[PDB]
């Protein structure tokens, strides 16, 4: 699943759509290769834990979409 071919200079988007537990939302993109934009998205919601409490992942459109989600 999830077939990829690796380029070292890939170039694409990773878009991350944001739910915070009151509801509110926000979109955020990375890019770059596939696998650096994931892990940029990813280190963006670390940084919105303290404020915002844990996530969670639900990957969407190929991994090509992260819709996460806060606790609180
Ligand atoms: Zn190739
Ligand atoms: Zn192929
Ligand atoms: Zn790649
Ligand atoms: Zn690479
Ligand atoms: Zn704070």
């Given at each position: 699943?999830?077939?990829?071919?690796?380029?070292?200079?890939?170039?694409?988007?990773?878009?991350?759509?944001?739910?915070?537990?009151?509801?509110?939302?926000?979109?955020?993109?990375?890019?770059?290769?596939?696998?650096?934009?994931?892990?940029?998205?990813?280190?963006?919601?670390?940084?919105?834990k303290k404020d915002?409490?844990?996530?969670?992942?639900?990957?969407?459109?190929?991994?090509?979409?992260?819709?996460?989600?806060?606790?609180?």
């Amino acid at each position: 699943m999830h077939h990829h071919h690796h380029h070292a200079m890939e170039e694409v988007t990773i878009k991350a759509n944001l739910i915070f537990a009151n509801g509110s939302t926000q979109t955020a993109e990375f890019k770059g290769t596939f696998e650096k934009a994931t892990s940029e998205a990813y280190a963006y919601a670390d940084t919105l834990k303290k404020d915002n409490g844990e996530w969670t992942v639900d990957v969407a459109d190929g991994g090509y979409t992260l819709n996460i989600k806060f606790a609180g």
